[PDB]
């Protein structure tokens, strides 16, 4: 039986919501015993990702990621790091600890390739500084980058609303204004906390916005992805 | 930093909801880095608990519990098995694998001691057959037992509604009728899926029912319990 390992806690609110998504998207038919097997390491003590870039302390963060990948390699068959910015550490991690890894950047890339329309990357300044989507996606030409000022506003939404567990729909107007400003109807969840927004839109039946949301995709396609 | 280990997946819907409860009850003040560190083994492939009792296959179930306690003993500082019925396996498990264990039966017992009023045990036939609450609680005299017929109705609620992720408030009328039938205003979540009901009551501000709910208690008192 295949086990998904989740290096989580970045942040904890979205980590818990992702685990919930896994079972919401894979309801069992007859017995509970059919349902996805998942190991979650929800460690919010993980250093601030953008903080680790803005200060000099990338080594500290990379070690955190490496030690926990060592654990999860022994326990799980596939691994996901529940944080986009955190993927910046991967070039420094030995290749053996990334054999089972499913990249959120690549999941986003595959989805955007099918959608094939310009889409607004909603992400932290850290994710933008490290150019994770621009350097990782075959569909980089379809990715619209936020300006520096709008990146800082996304930061506020992430830290003041989403990470603190407040209603994700409270930022919907700010998001719709951004989409209108950048002339698109789609966003990429370039920050995992936008899984929370994506769920809230789906719950309300708001189909006007296309969300390229890697965590929703992983949950939805668990059967096929997790081998 | 103290880590809670959760042997979960019994069932998965309540396991995910419990992890969510942990962060809902412990909102951070300044930084995310303050928040609870938790390892969840959500393995729904765990054999049916009552099924393992009704068939002859307790050994199979005990081994499942033992192998995963071996893992979590190395990783966590405190351990919780997210299933009341599953506690029946503990007498067969070596004493070294239970040093870090926090019993849901004991958490319920401590709470009932403070409340000090008769309370209806909502639990599976398996939990009743094994007499986990009657044999484990100092406050056993305050525990009202469901009749055999009403135990089977609780079974239906658990399997048809709660485990399948349907709205826990859909069984509220049946629960209120039971409380009235047994002449009390309190229940014990003798089955972990009643954490889902407890959350739903709290969300709606229904204060007329007292829920002795071990998972809510563990989430709420994480700081003090998890050492």
């Amino acid at each position: 039986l295949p086990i998904l390992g989740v290096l989580g806690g970045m942040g904890p609110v979205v980590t818990a919501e992702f685990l919930k998504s896994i079972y919401e998207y894979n309801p069992f038919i007859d017995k509970e015993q059919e349902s996805p097997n998942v190991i979650v390491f929800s460690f919010p003590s993980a250093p601030d990702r953008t903080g680790s870039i803005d200060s000099g302390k990338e080594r500290e963060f990379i070690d955190f990621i490496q030690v926990n990948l060592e654990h999860l390699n022994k326990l799980a068959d596939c691994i996901v790091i529940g944080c986009c910015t955190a993927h910046y550490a991967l070039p420094q991690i030995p290749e053996n600890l990334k054999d089972k890894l499913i990249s959120l950047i690549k999941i986003a890339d595959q989805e955007l390739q099918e959608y094939n329309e310009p889409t607004l990357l909603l992400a932290s300044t850290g994710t933008y500084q490290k150019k994770l989507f621009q350097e990782g996606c075959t569909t980089a030409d379809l990715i619209i980058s936020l300006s520096e000022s709008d990146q800082k506003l996304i930061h506020e939404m992430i830290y003041k609303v989403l990470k603190r567990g407040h209603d994700p729909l409270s930022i919907l107007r700010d998001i719709e204004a951004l989409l209108e400003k950048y002339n698109t109807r789609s966003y990429i969840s370039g920050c995992t906390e936008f899984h929370l927004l994506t769920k809230s839109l789906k719950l309300k039946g708001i189909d006007s916005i296309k969300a390229i949301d890697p965590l929703s995709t992983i949950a939805q396609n668990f059967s096929q992805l997790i081998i």
Side-chain angles (χ1 to χ4, degrees), chain A:
Chain A
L1 276 162
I3 298 169
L4 172 57
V6 181
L7 183 43
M10 314 177 252
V13 171
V14 72
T15 304
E17 197 64 57
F18 175 47
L19 186 57
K20 187 157 171 182
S21 301
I22 287 169
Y23 298 116
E24 284 171 353
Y25 271 99
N26 299 271
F28 65 85
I29 303 301
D30 287 319
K31 284 177 81 90
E32 203 154 68
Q33 280 63 35
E34 299 156 32
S35 292
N37 297 264
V38 190
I39 294 174
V40 184
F41 282 19
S42 183
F43 302 152
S45 58
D48 192 299
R49 273 62 62 195
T50 289
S52 76
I53 301 165
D54 292 350
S55 75
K57 299 183 147 170
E58 298 188 6
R59 202 73 232 166
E60 158 170 271
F61 183 76
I62 293 155
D63 292 327
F64 171 86
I65 296 290
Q66 196 171 342
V67 182
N68 292 305
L69 283 182
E70 273 161 23
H71 297 310
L72 286 165
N73 265 257
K74 296 151 167 173
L75 299 167
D77 302 306
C78 308
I79 297 172
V80 172
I81 298 170
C83 178
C84 291
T85 311
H87 287 71
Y88 95 79
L90 296 180
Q92 308 284 66
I93 307 297
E95 302 293 310
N96 54 303
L97 304 180
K98 306 183 292 195
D99 291 323
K100 302 143 172 287
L101 198 65
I102 292 169
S103 172
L104 301 181
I105 281 70
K106 293 185 201 160
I107 292 292
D109 190 31
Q110 291 164 18
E111 165 136 64
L112 180 51
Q113 194 183 303
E114 291 165 49
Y115 182 59
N116 199 27
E117 225 89 281
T119 304
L120 188 58
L121 177 63
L122 304 176
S124 66
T125 51
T127 283
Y128 272 103
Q129 281 176 31
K130 298 287 173 179
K131 304 157 109 160
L132 300 174
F133 285 88
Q134 302 94 307
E135 297 182 359
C137 296
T138 61
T139 55
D141 62 319
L142 298 170
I143 294 174
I144 304 156
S145 293
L146 292 162
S147 67
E148 290 184 11
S149 302
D150 289 331
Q151 287 172 38
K152 293 172 211 137
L153 296 178
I154 291 304
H155 226 80
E156 295 302 320
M157 288 174 223
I158 289 160
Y159 281 87
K160 296 171 148 53
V161 181
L162 298 176
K163 284 182 178 289
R164 308 191 106 91
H166 301 139
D167 188 1
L169 295 168
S170 66
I171 68 160
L172 176 55
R173 289 171 190 178
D174 293 328
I175 294 295
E176 278 171 322
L178 283 168
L179 290 175
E180 206 253 299
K181 174 173 170 174
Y182 291 86
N183 195 38
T184 178
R185 292 139 187 230
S186 49
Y187 65 79
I188 293 157
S189 297
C191 158
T192 56
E193 275 73 14
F194 289 103
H195 181 61
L196 304 168
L197 179 61
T198 302
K199 288 249 284 197
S200 290
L201 296 172
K202 204 204 188 212
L203 188 65
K204 298 280 149 144
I206 300 180
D207 66 330
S208 56
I209 298 171
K210 168 69 179 175
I212 291 158
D213 186 60
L215 293 175
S216 288
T217 303
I218 291 162
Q220 178 164 12
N221 305 323
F222 192 98
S223 295
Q224 314 114 253
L225 291 177
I226 311 304
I227 309 299

